[PDB]
Amino acid sequence: LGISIMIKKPQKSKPGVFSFLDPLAYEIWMCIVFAYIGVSVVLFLVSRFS
Protein backbone atom coordinates (compact mmCIF):
# COMPACT_ATOMS: atom_id res chain seq x y z
CA LEU A 1 0.00 0.00 0.00
CA GLY A 2 1.05 3.62 0.26
CA ILE A 3 -0.01 7.21 0.69
CA SER A 4 -2.72 7.87 -1.88
CA ILE A 5 -4.76 10.82 -3.11
CA MET A 6 -8.45 11.17 -2.30
CA ILE A 7 -10.69 13.63 -4.15
CA LYS A 8 -14.42 14.21 -4.50
CA LYS A 9 -15.94 12.10 -7.24
CA PRO A 10 -16.75 14.26 -10.29
CA GLN A 11 -20.50 14.28 -10.88
CA LYS A 12 -22.04 13.60 -14.27
CA SER A 13 -22.97 17.31 -14.51
CA LYS A 14 -25.90 16.93 -16.87
CA PRO A 15 -26.49 20.00 -19.06
CA GLY A 16 -29.53 22.17 -18.64
CA VAL A 17 -32.53 21.83 -20.91
CA PHE A 18 -31.95 25.26 -22.46
CA SER A 19 -28.17 25.14 -22.23
CA PHE A 20 -27.80 26.30 -25.83
CA LEU A 21 -28.53 29.86 -24.70
CA ASP A 22 -25.45 30.11 -22.48
CA PRO A 23 -23.01 31.68 -25.00
CA LEU A 24 -25.05 34.88 -24.64
CA ALA A 25 -26.34 36.32 -21.37
CA TYR A 26 -30.01 36.73 -20.50
CA GLU A 27 -29.87 40.47 -21.08
CA ILE A 28 -28.60 39.99 -24.62
CA TRP A 29 -31.42 37.64 -25.61
CA MET A 30 -34.12 39.84 -24.15
CA CYS A 31 -32.70 42.98 -25.73
CA ILE A 32 -32.61 41.07 -29.03
CA VAL A 33 -36.35 40.45 -28.69
CA PHE A 34 -37.05 44.07 -27.79
CA ALA A 35 -34.91 45.48 -30.58
CA TYR A 36 -36.71 43.14 -32.98
CA ILE A 37 -40.07 44.60 -32.00
CA GLY A 38 -38.69 48.12 -32.25
CA VAL A 39 -37.19 47.57 -35.69
CA SER A 40 -40.36 45.97 -37.02
CA VAL A 41 -42.49 48.91 -35.89
CA VAL A 42 -40.06 51.52 -37.23
CA LEU A 43 -39.80 49.77 -40.61
CA PHE A 44 -43.59 49.62 -40.85
CA LEU A 45 -43.96 53.29 -39.93
CA VAL A 46 -41.33 54.50 -42.38
CA SER A 47 -42.75 52.35 -45.16
CA ARG A 48 -46.17 54.01 -44.87
CA PHE A 49 -46.43 57.73 -45.66
CA SER A 50 -49.41 59.18 -47.50
Place this chain on the structure above:
Amino acid sequence: VVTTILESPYVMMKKNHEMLEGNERYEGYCVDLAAEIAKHCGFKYKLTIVGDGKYGARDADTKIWNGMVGELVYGKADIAIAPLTITLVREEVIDFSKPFMSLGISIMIKKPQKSKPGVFSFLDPLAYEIWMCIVFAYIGVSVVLFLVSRFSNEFGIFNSLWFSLGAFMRQGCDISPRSLSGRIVGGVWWFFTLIIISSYTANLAAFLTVERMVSPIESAEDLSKQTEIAYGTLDSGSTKEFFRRSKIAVFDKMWTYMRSAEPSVFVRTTAEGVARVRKSKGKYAYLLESTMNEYIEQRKPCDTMKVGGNLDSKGYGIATPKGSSLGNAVNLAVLKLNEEGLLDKLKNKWWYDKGECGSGGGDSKEKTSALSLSNVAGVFYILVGGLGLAMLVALIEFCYKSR
Protein backbone atom coordinates in the same frame (compact mmCIF):
# COMPACT_ATOMS: atom_id res chain seq x y z
CA VAL B 1 27.41 40.31 19.65
CA VAL B 2 26.05 40.86 16.14
CA THR B 3 23.44 43.45 15.26
CA THR B 4 20.51 43.01 12.86
CA ILE B 5 17.41 44.87 11.68
CA LEU B 6 13.66 44.24 11.67
CA GLU B 7 12.95 44.01 7.92
CA SER B 8 10.34 41.31 7.54
CA PRO B 9 11.88 38.84 5.02
CA TYR B 10 15.35 39.05 6.58
CA VAL B 11 14.87 38.99 10.38
CA MET B 12 11.33 38.42 11.62
CA MET B 13 9.66 37.80 14.96
CA LYS B 14 7.65 34.56 14.84
CA LYS B 15 4.20 33.85 16.27
CA ASN B 16 4.17 34.10 20.07
CA HIS B 17 7.45 35.99 20.28
CA GLU B 18 7.12 35.94 24.08
CA MET B 19 7.58 32.16 24.25
CA LEU B 20 10.28 32.16 21.54
CA GLU B 21 12.53 35.18 22.04
CA GLY B 22 16.22 35.93 21.70
CA ASN B 23 19.02 34.24 19.83
CA GLU B 24 17.66 30.81 20.72
CA ARG B 25 14.62 31.19 18.44
CA TYR B 26 14.50 33.77 15.63
CA GLU B 27 13.22 33.46 12.08
CA GLY B 28 14.60 35.15 9.00
CA TYR B 29 16.91 34.91 6.03
CA CYS B 30 19.66 36.80 7.85
CA VAL B 31 19.12 34.46 10.81
CA ASP B 32 19.97 31.44 8.67
CA LEU B 33 22.88 33.39 7.21
CA ALA B 34 24.25 34.02 10.70
CA ALA B 35 23.78 30.36 11.59
CA GLU B 36 25.72 29.26 8.53
CA ILE B 37 28.47 31.85 8.95
CA ALA B 38 28.92 30.49 12.48
CA LYS B 39 28.89 26.90 11.21
CA HIS B 40 31.73 27.79 8.84
CA CYS B 41 33.45 30.10 11.37
CA GLY B 42 32.73 28.83 14.88
CA PHE B 43 32.29 31.72 17.29
CA LYS B 44 30.15 33.02 20.14
CA TYR B 45 27.45 35.34 18.80
CA LYS B 46 24.37 36.74 20.52
CA LEU B 47 21.67 38.29 18.34
CA THR B 48 21.51 41.88 19.59
CA ILE B 49 19.06 43.81 17.42
CA VAL B 50 20.09 47.40 16.80
CA GLY B 51 18.65 49.74 19.40
CA ASP B 52 18.15 52.66 17.03
CA GLY B 53 16.26 50.51 14.52
CA LYS B 54 17.81 52.04 11.40
CA TYR B 55 20.90 51.88 9.20
CA GLY B 56 23.98 54.03 9.44
CA ALA B 57 24.19 57.73 8.64
CA ARG B 58 26.05 60.72 10.06
CA ASP B 59 24.69 64.13 10.99
CA ALA B 60 26.69 67.00 9.52
CA ASP B 61 27.11 68.74 12.88
CA THR B 62 26.85 65.75 15.23
CA LYS B 63 29.26 63.70 13.09
CA ILE B 64 28.28 60.41 14.72
CA TRP B 65 27.11 57.10 13.29
CA ASN B 66 23.84 55.55 14.37
CA GLY B 67 22.19 52.20 13.92
CA MET B 68 24.28 49.30 12.66
CA VAL B 69 27.15 51.62 11.79
CA GLY B 70 27.23 53.33 15.19
CA GLU B 71 26.96 49.93 16.85
CA LEU B 72 30.11 48.86 14.94
CA VAL B 73 32.44 51.87 14.78
CA TYR B 74 32.01 52.39 18.55
CA GLY B 75 32.70 48.78 19.51
CA LYS B 76 29.13 48.24 20.68
CA ALA B 77 28.90 44.99 18.70
CA ASP B 78 31.10 42.62 16.70
CA ILE B 79 29.56 42.61 13.18
CA ALA B 80 26.27 43.33 11.39
CA ILE B 81 24.65 40.42 9.53
CA ALA B 82 21.92 42.47 7.88
CA PRO B 83 21.21 44.25 4.58
CA LEU B 84 23.63 47.15 4.26
CA THR B 85 23.74 48.87 0.91
CA ILE B 86 27.49 48.93 0.36
CA THR B 87 28.53 52.51 -0.23
CA LEU B 88 31.49 54.85 -0.06
CA VAL B 89 30.77 56.42 3.33
CA ARG B 90 29.99 53.15 5.12
CA GLU B 91 33.08 51.44 3.70
CA GLU B 92 35.28 54.33 4.84
CA VAL B 93 34.35 53.48 8.43
CA ILE B 94 33.63 49.73 8.36
CA ASP B 95 35.18 46.81 6.47
CA PHE B 96 32.67 45.31 4.05
CA SER B 97 32.35 41.72 2.90
CA LYS B 98 32.04 40.80 -0.72
CA PRO B 99 28.39 41.41 -1.62
CA PHE B 100 26.33 38.40 -0.61
CA MET B 101 23.38 39.70 -2.64
CA SER B 102 23.19 42.12 -5.58
CA LEU B 103 20.12 44.16 -6.47
CA GLY B 104 18.83 47.37 -8.00
CA ILE B 105 15.98 49.84 -8.37
CA SER B 106 13.18 47.68 -9.72
CA ILE B 107 9.88 48.88 -11.18
CA MET B 108 6.63 47.94 -9.46
CA ILE B 109 3.29 47.98 -11.27
CA LYS B 110 -0.13 46.53 -10.57
CA LYS B 111 -0.71 43.14 -12.12
CA PRO B 112 -2.33 43.62 -15.56
CA GLN B 113 -5.90 42.34 -15.32
CA LYS B 114 -8.61 42.30 -17.96
CA SER B 115 -10.36 45.64 -18.36
CA LYS B 116 -14.05 46.29 -18.80
CA PRO B 117 -14.89 45.66 -22.48
CA GLY B 118 -15.29 49.04 -24.08
CA VAL B 119 -17.99 50.32 -26.35
CA PHE B 120 -17.26 49.51 -30.01
CA SER B 121 -15.36 46.38 -29.00
CA PHE B 122 -17.18 44.21 -31.53
CA LEU B 123 -14.75 45.36 -34.24
CA ASP B 124 -11.67 44.14 -32.37
CA PRO B 125 -11.16 40.82 -34.25
CA LEU B 126 -10.19 42.77 -37.37
CA ALA B 127 -7.66 45.58 -37.54
CA TYR B 128 -8.70 49.14 -38.32
CA GLU B 129 -7.06 49.05 -41.75
CA ILE B 130 -9.10 45.99 -42.68
CA TRP B 131 -12.36 47.68 -41.71
CA MET B 132 -11.55 50.74 -43.78
CA CYS B 133 -10.54 48.58 -46.74
CA ILE B 134 -13.84 46.71 -46.40
CA VAL B 135 -15.82 49.95 -46.55
CA PHE B 136 -14.03 51.22 -49.61
CA ALA B 137 -14.08 47.82 -51.30
CA TYR B 138 -17.86 47.75 -50.95
CA ILE B 139 -18.13 51.25 -52.41
CA GLY B 140 -15.78 50.27 -55.23
CA VAL B 141 -17.62 47.07 -56.11
CA SER B 142 -20.99 48.80 -56.22
CA VAL B 143 -19.70 51.53 -58.52
CA VAL B 144 -18.09 49.02 -60.86
CA LEU B 145 -21.25 46.91 -60.95
CA PHE B 146 -23.22 50.03 -61.85
CA LEU B 147 -20.82 50.99 -64.64
CA VAL B 148 -20.85 47.46 -66.02
CA SER B 149 -24.64 47.20 -66.04
CA ARG B 150 -24.85 50.64 -67.69
CA PHE B 151 -22.38 50.05 -70.51
CA SER B 152 -24.33 47.06 -71.86
CA ASN B 153 -30.79 46.32 -66.19
CA GLU B 154 -32.17 47.90 -63.02
CA PHE B 155 -28.72 48.10 -61.42
CA GLY B 156 -28.67 51.82 -60.86
CA ILE B 157 -26.30 53.11 -58.23
CA PHE B 158 -28.92 53.09 -55.48
CA ASN B 159 -30.16 49.63 -56.43
CA SER B 160 -26.62 48.25 -56.73
CA LEU B 161 -25.33 49.50 -53.38
CA TRP B 162 -28.24 47.57 -51.87
CA PHE B 163 -27.26 44.40 -53.74
CA SER B 164 -23.64 44.65 -52.59
CA LEU B 165 -24.66 45.29 -48.99
CA GLY B 166 -27.13 42.42 -49.09
CA ALA B 167 -24.46 40.08 -50.42
CA PHE B 168 -22.00 41.08 -47.70
CA MET B 169 -24.39 40.62 -44.78
CA ARG B 170 -25.20 37.08 -45.95
CA GLN B 171 -28.85 38.03 -46.43
CA GLY B 172 -30.34 36.84 -49.68
CA CYS B 173 -30.08 39.07 -52.73
CA ASP B 174 -33.20 40.56 -54.28
CA ILE B 175 -31.91 40.38 -57.87
CA SER B 176 -28.89 38.93 -59.63
CA PRO B 177 -26.76 40.12 -62.55
CA ARG B 178 -27.61 38.63 -65.93
CA SER B 179 -24.73 39.68 -68.18
CA LEU B 180 -21.32 38.06 -68.04
CA SER B 181 -19.49 41.15 -66.84
CA GLY B 182 -21.97 41.70 -64.03
CA ARG B 183 -21.72 38.07 -62.97
CA ILE B 184 -17.92 38.23 -62.68
CA VAL B 185 -18.25 41.10 -60.20
CA GLY B 186 -21.00 39.29 -58.33
CA GLY B 187 -18.93 36.14 -58.00
CA VAL B 188 -15.72 37.75 -56.85
CA TRP B 189 -17.52 39.89 -54.27
CA TRP B 190 -19.32 36.79 -52.98
CA PHE B 191 -15.97 35.07 -52.49
CA PHE B 192 -14.55 38.13 -50.75
CA THR B 193 -17.44 38.37 -48.29
CA LEU B 194 -17.27 34.66 -47.50
CA ILE B 195 -13.59 34.87 -46.62
CA ILE B 196 -13.94 38.03 -44.53
CA ILE B 197 -16.87 36.75 -42.48
CA SER B 198 -15.10 33.45 -41.83
CA SER B 199 -11.98 35.35 -40.76
CA TYR B 200 -13.93 37.59 -38.38
CA THR B 201 -15.74 34.69 -36.72
CA ALA B 202 -12.58 32.61 -36.37
CA ASN B 203 -10.46 35.40 -34.93
CA LEU B 204 -13.21 36.34 -32.49
CA ALA B 205 -13.30 32.73 -31.33
CA ALA B 206 -9.54 32.91 -30.82
CA PHE B 207 -9.97 36.08 -28.76
CA LEU B 208 -12.59 34.49 -26.54
CA THR B 209 -10.87 31.12 -26.06
CA VAL B 210 -7.35 32.01 -24.92
CA GLU B 211 -6.80 35.35 -23.21
CA ARG B 212 -3.39 37.00 -23.46
CA MET B 213 -2.49 39.80 -21.06
CA VAL B 214 0.34 42.24 -21.80
CA SER B 215 2.12 44.56 -19.40
CA PRO B 216 1.44 48.19 -20.38
CA ILE B 217 5.05 49.17 -19.59
CA GLU B 218 8.15 47.01 -20.02
CA SER B 219 11.17 49.07 -18.93
CA ALA B 220 11.99 52.52 -17.62
CA GLU B 221 13.39 53.43 -21.04
CA ASP B 222 9.77 53.32 -22.21
CA LEU B 223 8.25 54.48 -18.93
CA SER B 224 9.96 57.82 -19.49
CA LYS B 225 8.50 58.06 -23.00
CA GLN B 226 4.96 57.08 -21.95
CA THR B 227 4.28 59.85 -19.37
CA GLU B 228 0.59 58.87 -19.25
CA ILE B 229 1.43 56.64 -16.26
CA ALA B 230 2.50 58.36 -13.06
CA TYR B 231 5.55 56.79 -11.41
CA GLY B 232 6.86 57.69 -7.98
CA THR B 233 9.54 56.93 -5.43
CA LEU B 234 9.77 57.06 -1.66
CA ASP B 235 10.08 60.50 -0.06
CA SER B 236 13.83 60.68 0.47
CA GLY B 237 16.57 58.07 0.56
CA SER B 238 18.83 56.17 -1.78
CA THR B 239 16.25 56.24 -4.57
CA LYS B 240 15.45 59.96 -4.56
CA GLU B 241 19.09 60.96 -4.07
CA PHE B 242 20.05 58.65 -6.91
CA PHE B 243 17.54 60.22 -9.26
CA ARG B 244 18.59 63.76 -8.38
CA ARG B 245 22.30 62.92 -8.71
CA SER B 246 21.78 60.96 -11.94
CA LYS B 247 23.07 62.27 -15.25
CA ILE B 248 21.93 59.64 -17.77
CA ALA B 249 19.36 60.93 -20.25
CA VAL B 250 16.48 58.60 -19.38
CA PHE B 251 16.96 58.94 -15.64
CA ASP B 252 17.34 62.70 -15.84
CA LYS B 253 14.02 62.85 -17.69
CA MET B 254 12.37 60.55 -15.14
CA TRP B 255 13.56 62.94 -12.45
CA THR B 256 12.55 66.15 -14.23
CA TYR B 257 9.06 64.72 -14.56
CA MET B 258 8.71 63.78 -10.91
CA ARG B 259 10.32 66.95 -9.54
CA SER B 260 7.54 69.06 -11.11
CA ALA B 261 4.29 67.08 -11.06
CA GLU B 262 1.04 67.33 -9.10
CA PRO B 263 -0.22 65.84 -6.89
CA SER B 264 2.47 64.51 -4.54
CA VAL B 265 3.69 61.45 -6.42
CA PHE B 266 6.40 60.83 -3.82
CA VAL B 267 5.03 58.48 -1.17
CA ARG B 268 5.49 58.79 2.58
CA THR B 269 6.30 55.12 3.15
CA THR B 270 6.67 51.93 1.15
CA ALA B 271 3.48 50.51 2.66
CA GLU B 272 1.62 53.58 1.42
CA GLY B 273 3.32 53.21 -1.96
CA VAL B 274 2.25 49.61 -2.44
CA ALA B 275 -1.22 50.47 -1.14
CA ARG B 276 -1.45 53.27 -3.71
CA VAL B 277 -0.29 50.98 -6.52
CA ARG B 278 -2.78 48.29 -5.53
CA LYS B 279 -5.69 50.71 -5.02
CA SER B 280 -5.19 52.74 -8.19
CA LYS B 281 -5.28 51.37 -11.72
CA GLY B 282 -2.27 50.72 -13.94
CA LYS B 283 -1.62 54.47 -13.93
CA TYR B 284 0.78 54.26 -10.96
CA ALA B 285 4.24 52.65 -10.96
CA TYR B 286 6.54 52.39 -7.95
CA LEU B 287 10.36 52.40 -8.03
CA LEU B 288 11.82 50.50 -5.08
CA GLU B 289 14.71 48.19 -4.26
CA SER B 290 14.60 44.99 -6.29
CA THR B 291 14.58 42.66 -3.29
CA MET B 292 11.72 44.39 -1.52
CA ASN B 293 9.65 44.32 -4.71
CA GLU B 294 10.35 40.65 -5.38
CA TYR B 295 9.35 39.83 -1.81
CA ILE B 296 6.19 41.96 -1.91
CA GLU B 297 4.89 40.43 -5.12
CA GLN B 298 4.89 37.02 -3.42
CA ARG B 299 2.74 37.83 -0.39
CA LYS B 300 -1.03 38.14 -0.45
CA PRO B 301 -3.03 39.40 -2.20
CA CYS B 302 -0.41 38.91 -4.95
CA ASP B 303 -1.98 41.81 -6.85
CA THR B 304 1.33 43.34 -7.98
CA MET B 305 4.30 42.30 -10.07
CA LYS B 306 7.83 43.33 -11.02
CA VAL B 307 8.54 44.53 -14.55
CA GLY B 308 11.84 45.40 -16.18
CA GLY B 309 15.43 44.98 -15.14
CA ASN B 310 17.34 46.67 -12.37
CA LEU B 311 18.15 50.30 -13.09
CA ASP B 312 21.35 50.57 -11.00
CA SER B 313 23.20 47.77 -9.21
CA LYS B 314 24.38 47.74 -5.60
CA GLY B 315 25.07 44.91 -3.19
CA TYR B 316 24.53 43.94 0.43
CA GLY B 317 27.41 43.22 2.79
CA ILE B 318 28.34 41.85 6.20
CA ALA B 319 29.96 44.74 8.02
CA THR B 320 32.97 44.38 10.34
CA PRO B 321 35.07 47.06 12.09
CA LYS B 322 38.47 47.79 10.63
CA GLY B 323 40.72 46.34 13.28
CA SER B 324 38.81 43.11 13.79
CA SER B 325 40.57 39.77 13.55
CA LEU B 326 37.19 38.58 12.25
CA GLY B 327 37.45 40.98 9.30
CA ASN B 328 39.05 38.48 6.92
CA ALA B 329 37.23 35.49 8.41
CA VAL B 330 34.00 36.58 6.69
CA ASN B 331 35.13 37.41 3.14
CA LEU B 332 36.25 33.86 2.44
CA ALA B 333 33.21 32.28 4.06
CA VAL B 334 30.81 34.54 2.13
CA LEU B 335 32.55 33.67 -1.14
CA LYS B 336 32.39 29.96 -0.33
CA LEU B 337 28.71 30.18 0.61
CA ASN B 338 28.00 32.00 -2.64
CA GLU B 339 29.95 29.42 -4.65
CA GLU B 340 28.40 26.35 -3.01
CA GLY B 341 24.92 27.36 -4.12
CA LEU B 342 23.85 27.69 -0.50
CA LEU B 343 23.02 31.40 -0.39
CA ASP B 344 20.87 31.07 -3.51
CA LYS B 345 19.13 28.06 -1.97
CA LEU B 346 18.48 30.07 1.18
CA LYS B 347 16.96 32.97 -0.75
CA ASN B 348 14.93 30.61 -2.94
CA LYS B 349 13.43 28.88 0.08
CA TRP B 350 12.84 32.05 2.09
CA TRP B 351 11.14 33.90 -0.77
CA TYR B 352 9.45 31.40 -3.10
CA ASP B 353 8.92 28.38 -0.83
CA LYS B 354 7.37 30.65 1.80
CA GLY B 355 5.30 32.24 -0.97
CA GLU B 356 1.64 33.11 -0.59
CA CYS B 357 0.96 32.36 -4.26
CA GLY B 358 2.41 30.17 -7.00
CA SER B 359 2.65 30.91 -10.71
CA GLY B 360 2.18 27.40 -12.08
CA GLY B 361 -1.11 26.63 -10.35
CA GLY B 362 -2.92 29.62 -11.82
CA ASP B 363 -0.91 29.54 -15.04
CA SER B 364 -3.90 28.61 -17.22
CA LYS B 365 -6.88 28.31 -14.82
CA GLU B 366 -9.00 29.21 -17.84
CA LYS B 367 -12.74 29.75 -17.44
CA THR B 368 -15.16 31.14 -20.02
CA SER B 369 -18.20 33.27 -19.29
CA ALA B 370 -21.29 34.29 -21.21
CA LEU B 371 -21.02 37.45 -23.29
CA SER B 372 -22.49 40.16 -21.11
CA LEU B 373 -24.47 43.05 -22.54
CA SER B 374 -21.40 45.24 -21.99
CA ASN B 375 -19.45 43.49 -24.75
CA VAL B 376 -22.22 43.88 -27.30
CA ALA B 377 -23.99 47.15 -26.42
CA GLY B 378 -21.73 48.91 -28.88
CA VAL B 379 -23.93 47.41 -31.60
CA PHE B 380 -27.23 48.16 -29.87
CA TYR B 381 -26.21 51.81 -29.89
CA ILE B 382 -25.54 51.62 -33.63
CA LEU B 383 -28.85 49.87 -34.23
CA VAL B 384 -30.88 52.54 -32.47
CA GLY B 385 -28.84 55.28 -34.11
CA GLY B 386 -29.64 53.81 -37.51
CA LEU B 387 -33.33 53.66 -36.70
CA GLY B 388 -33.39 57.28 -35.58
CA LEU B 389 -31.56 58.29 -38.74
CA ALA B 390 -34.04 56.35 -40.88
CA MET B 391 -36.99 58.16 -39.34
CA LEU B 392 -35.19 61.47 -39.85
CA VAL B 393 -34.52 60.91 -43.55
CA ALA B 394 -38.09 59.68 -44.00
CA LEU B 395 -39.42 62.97 -42.66
CA ILE B 396 -36.96 64.96 -44.77
CA GLU B 397 -38.05 63.17 -47.95
CA PHE B 398 -41.71 63.58 -46.99
CA CYS B 399 -41.33 67.31 -46.40
CA TYR B 400 -39.38 67.78 -49.64
CA LYS B 401 -41.92 65.81 -51.70
CA SER B 402 -44.89 67.62 -50.16
CA ARG B 403 -43.57 70.84 -51.73
